[PDB]
């Protein structure tokens, strides 16, 4: 299948209560491999996947130096953005940053990305050409001009299209058993009477990896989209994911309804039913 490496960074200012909170996590596909937390004891980038543990001290020292430069960059940004939007010193504000790269199933570069948000709203984001920024407002156009200066634009380019890709592949190789795997959902349905004329039908998918899954209910072939309760895909905690979709069915009509599961693990999409 296709693969991705993503880093996610959150900084939250906390006026009067010391330095801003900074959390960074990296992921290959839906598996976390590293963390940094400004509030933890170590003040180091820390392993979170068994396969990354084999990296030497040059890796750990360098990622720690690098993650701390991201921390410091965000600490300045928080003041900068408060000045750009004329906000007071007293409130808490959030900056979020995500970047990374996708590769196709031949492991060659597909796309690279770098997106930034301020208070949960889009701020600036890099287009697919890795050169042009989409800027939210006037404040972000100032950011755009800084970041599109040719020296700066090139360091980012060389990261996303080169380094990010090379290290993703290295990680894919080193963590083969975890990362180059597909776990097909284990599926079942349940039925519960909410009254003597109505029943909840619930379609379950358990133990699947990667997280991407589509679970939909049909009534005689028509999509029951506005009448389905569909929960957010959620982690089991052991490296696999879970999801369910539920419909409330007038009792006697169970056979009309089919659940449909699509997942890269299934060779053919499944159709489940009360026959």
């Amino acid at each position: 299948g296709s693969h991705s490496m993503r880093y996610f960074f959150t900084s939250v200012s906390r006026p009067g209560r010391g330095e801003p909170r900074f959390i960074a996590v990296g992921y290959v596909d839906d598996t976390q491999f590293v963390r940094f937390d400004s509030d933890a004891a170590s003040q180091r980038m820390e392993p979170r996947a068994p396969w990354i543990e084999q990296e030497g001290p040059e890796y750990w020292d360098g990622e720690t130096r690098k993650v701390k430069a991201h921390s410091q960059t965000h600490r300045v940004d928080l003041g900068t953005l408060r000045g750009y939007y004329n906000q007071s010193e007293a409130g808490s504000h959030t900056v979020q940053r995500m970047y990374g790269c996708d590769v196709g199933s031949d492991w060659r570069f597909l796309r690279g990305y770098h997106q930034y948000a301020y208070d949960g709203k889009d701020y600036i984001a890099l287009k697919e050409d890795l050169r042009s920024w989409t800027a939210a407002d006037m404040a972000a156009q100032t950011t755009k001009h800084k970041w599109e200066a040719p020296h700066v634009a090139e360091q980012l380019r060389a990261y996303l299209e080169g380094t990010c890709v090379e290290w993703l592949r290295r990680y894919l190789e080193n963590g083969k058993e975890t990362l180059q795997r597909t776990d097909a959902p284990k599926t079942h349905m349940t039925h519960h009477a909410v009254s003597d004329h109505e029943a909840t039908l619930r379609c379950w998918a358990l133990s699947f990896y990667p997280a991407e899954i589509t679970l939909t209910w049909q009534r005689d072939g028509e999509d029951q989209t506005q009448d389905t309760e569909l929960v957010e895909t959620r982690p089991a905690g052991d490296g696999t994911f879970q999801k369910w979709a539920a419909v409330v069915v007038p009792s006697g009509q169970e056979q009309r309804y089919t659940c449909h599961v699509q997942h890269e693990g299934l060779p053919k999409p499944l159709t489940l039913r009360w026959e």
Partner: peptide, 9 residues
Amino acid sequence: LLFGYPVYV
């Protein structure tokens, strides 16, 4: 591997 050159907004 992290990006080596984050720049201020």
